[PDB]
Amino acid sequence: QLIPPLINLLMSIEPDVIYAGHDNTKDTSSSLLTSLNQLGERQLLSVVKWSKSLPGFRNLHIDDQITLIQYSWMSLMVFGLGWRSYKHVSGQMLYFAPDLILNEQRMKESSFYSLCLTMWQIPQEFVKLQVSQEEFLCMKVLLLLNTIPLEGLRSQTQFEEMRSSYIRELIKAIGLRQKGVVSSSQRFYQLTKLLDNLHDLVKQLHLYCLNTFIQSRALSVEFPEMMSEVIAAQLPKILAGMVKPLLFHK
Amino acid sequence: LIPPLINLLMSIEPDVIYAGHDNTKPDTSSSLLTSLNQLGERQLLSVVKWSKSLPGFRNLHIDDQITLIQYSWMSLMVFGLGWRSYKHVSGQMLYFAPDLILNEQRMKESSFYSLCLTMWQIPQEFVKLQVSQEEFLCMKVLLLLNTIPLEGLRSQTQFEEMRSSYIRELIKAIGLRQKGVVSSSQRFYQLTKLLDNLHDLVKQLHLYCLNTFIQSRALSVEFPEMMSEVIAAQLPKILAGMVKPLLFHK
Numbered sequence: 001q002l003i004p005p006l007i008n009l010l011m012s013i014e015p016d017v018i019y020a021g022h023d024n025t026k027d028t029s030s031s032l033l034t035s036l037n038q039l040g041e042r043q044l045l046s047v048v049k050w051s052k053s054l055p056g057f058r059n060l061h062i063d064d065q066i067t068l069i070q071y072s073w074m075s076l077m078v079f080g081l082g083w084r085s086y087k088h089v090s091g092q093m094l095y096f097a098p099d100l101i102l103n104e105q106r107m108k109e110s111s112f113y114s115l116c117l118t119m120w121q122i123p124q125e126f127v128k129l130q131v132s133q134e135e136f137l138c139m140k141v142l143l144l145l146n147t148i149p150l151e152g153l154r155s156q157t158q159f160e161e162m163r164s165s166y167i168r169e170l171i172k173a174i175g176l177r178q179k180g181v182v183s184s185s186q187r188f189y190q191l192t193k194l195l196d197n198l199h200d201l202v203k204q205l206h207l208y209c210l211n212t213f214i215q216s217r218a219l220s221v222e223f224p225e226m227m228s229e230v231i232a233a234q235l236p237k238i239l240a241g242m243v244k245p246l247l248f249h250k
Numbered sequence: 251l252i253p254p255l256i257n258l259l260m261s262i263e264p265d266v267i268y269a270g271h272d273n274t275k276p277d278t279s280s281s282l283l284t285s286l287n288q289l290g291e292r293q294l295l296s297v298v299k300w301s302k303s304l305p306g307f308r309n310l311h312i313d314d315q316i317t318l319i320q321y322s323w324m325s326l327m328v329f330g331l332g333w334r335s336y337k338h339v340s341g342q343m344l345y346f347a348p349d350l351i352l353n354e355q356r357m358k359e360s361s362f363y364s365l366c367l368t369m370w371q372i373p374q375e376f377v378k379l380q381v382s383q384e385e386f387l388c389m390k391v392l393l394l395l396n397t398i399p400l401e402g403l404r405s406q407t408q409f410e411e412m413r414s415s416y417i418r419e420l421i422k423a424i425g426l427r428q429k430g431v432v433s434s435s436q437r438f439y440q441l442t443k444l445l446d447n448l449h450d451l452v453k454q455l456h457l458y459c460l461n462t463f464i465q466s467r468a469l470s471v472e473f474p475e476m477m478s479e480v481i482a483a484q485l486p487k488i489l490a491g492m493v494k495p496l497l498f499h500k
C-alpha cells in the first residue's frame with residue numbers, strides 16, 4: 001500500500017537474530033575480541049546470503065559480487081551495529097548481539113574503548129536524525145555499493161543502474177515521512193552525508209582489525225576462516241587507499 | 251675539504267652485509283624472498299648499531315628512536331640497495347648483497363619482476379644525478395628522520411634540531427662539488443625532491459611486504475624476529491597513512 005514494494009522486499013530479506021555465541025560463564029581482551037570475531041564470521045555469512053536475494057545484485061558479474069561484499073563487509077557490520085544499538089538500547093550501549101551487549105564498563109582498554117567511541121557515532125546519529133527502517137534498508141544497500149576497484153567493476157553499467165534505483169528508493173523512503181520538498185531534500189543530504197562519513201569511520205575499524213589480525217597468535221585472538229580470507233585479501237589494499245570510495249558530496 | 255660531520259658519517263657506515271643465499275640452487279620464489287628477509291634482518295640490526303653512533307640520535311627519547319627506526323627501515327634499505335647497485339655494478343644490476351645480485355634476466359625469471367623494476371628505479375636515478383658519497387650519506391640520515399607520528403615525537407624540539415642539522419649538512423655536501431649559487435640551489439631541490447618521491451616508491455614495497463607477511467606460511471617465506479617485530483609494530487598504521495610523512499616540497 002503506502003510502502004513501496006522494493007522496501008517491503010528489503011524488510012523481508014533481513015537476517016534473523018545473530019548471536020556471537022559468547023561465553024557468559026567464564027571475560028577479557030582476547031576473549032571479547034575472539035567473540036566479536038566469531039560474530040563477525042556469522043555476520044559475513046549473513047551478508048552473503050542476503051546479497052543473493054537483493055534485487056539486482058546477483059545480476060552483477062560474480063567477481064564484482066565478491067569484491068563488493070569484501071569491500072563493504074566492515075561497513076555493513078558497523079552500520080548494522082548502529083541499527084541494533086539504536087533499536088534495542090536507544091543507542092546508549094553497543095548492541096553487537098543479544099549475547100554481547102557492551103557498555104562503558106566492558107571497555108577497559110584505551111585502544112578498544114577509543115574504537116567503540118568511534119562506532120558509537122552511528123547509533124548517535126541514528127537517534128539524532130531518527131532514521132526509519134525504510135531509510136536504513138535503502139542506505140544499507142547503498143553502503144554495499146559504496147566502493148569500487150580503481151579500474152572499476154566488470155559490470156560497471158549494471159552497477160550504476162542498480163545504485164541509481166536504490167538512490168531513488170531512498171528518496172521514496174524519505175518521502176514516507178518527510179513530506180516537504182525542502183525538508184525531504186535536506187534530509188536526503190543528511191542521510192547521504194552520513195554515508196560519506198562512514199568511509200572515514202570504517203578506516204579506523206579496518207586498521208584496528210588488521211593490526212589485531214597480524215598479532216592474533218600473540219594476542220591469543222582467534223579469527224575464523226571466512227573473515228580471515230576477507231581480511232587477508234582486501235584490508236591491506238583498502239587501507240593503502242588502492243580502491244575508489246564513492247561519495248555523494250565532493 | 252670534506253666537512254667533519256660528513257667524514258664521521260662515512261666512518262660509521264656498516265661493513266659488507268651478506269644475505270647468506272645458496273646460489274648453488276635454481277631460484278625459487280620462496281628461496282629468494284627468504285634470503286631477502288634474512289638480509290633484511292641483518293640490515294635492520296646494522297641500522298640499529300649505526301643509529302647508536304649517529305650524532306644526535308641517542309639524545310632523542312628512547313621511544314622516539316624506536317619509532318623512527320620502525321618507520322624508516324624500508325626506506326633506508328631500498329636507498330642502501332640503490333647506493334650499492336650504483337657503486338658496485340654501475341647501477342645495472344640489483345646488488346642486494348655480494349652473494350645476492352640480480353641482473354635483469356634473473357629479475358625477469360623471479361616471481362616479482364615488477365617489484366624488481368620498481369626498486370631498480372633508485373639506482374638508475376643515482377646514475378642520472380651522479381649522487382656523491384657525501385650527498386648520499388646526508389640523504390640517508392634525513393630518510394631516518396623523514397616520518398613522525400601524527401601527534402609528534404616526545405623529543406620533538408630535539409628531533410627538529412637534529413633534522414635541521416643534517417639538512418644543513420646536505421647543503422654542505424652539495425657545495426663540495428656544485429659551484430654557482432644557482433646550480434647548488436637547484437641541486438638541493440633535486441635531491442630533496444628525490445627524497446620526497448621515495449615515499450611513493452616505499453609505499454609499494456610496504457604493501458608487498460605486508461601481503462607477503464600475512465601469507466608467509468603459505469608461500470614458505472620466513473620473516474626473522476626483529477623484522478617481524480617492526481612489521482607488526484607499524485606497517486598497517488603506516489600503510490593507512492596514520493603517520494606524518496615529512497616533505498621538503500609542498
Ligand SMILES: C[C@@H](C(=O)N(C)C)N(CC(F)(F)F)c1ccc(C#N)c(C(F)(F)F)c1
Nearest residue numbers: 033036037040077078081096205208209212
Ligand atoms: C572484525 C572484528 C575484529 O577484527 N576484531 C579484532 C574484533 N571487529 C572489527 C573491529 F575493528 F571492531 F575490531 C568486529 C567484529 C564484529 C562486529 C560486529 N557486529 C564489528 C562492528 F562492525 F560492529 F564493529 C567489528
Ligand SMILES: C[C@@H](C(=O)N(C)C)N(CC(F)(F)F)c1ccc(C#N)c(C(F)(F)F)c1
Nearest residue numbers: 283286287290327328331346455458459462
Ligand atoms: C622486507 C622484505 C620483504 O618483506 N620480503 C617479502 C622479501 N623486502 C621488501 C620487499 F618489498 F621488497 F619485498 C626487502 C628485503 C630486503 C631488502 C634489501 N636490501 C629490500 C629492499 F630494500 F631492497 F627493498 C626489500
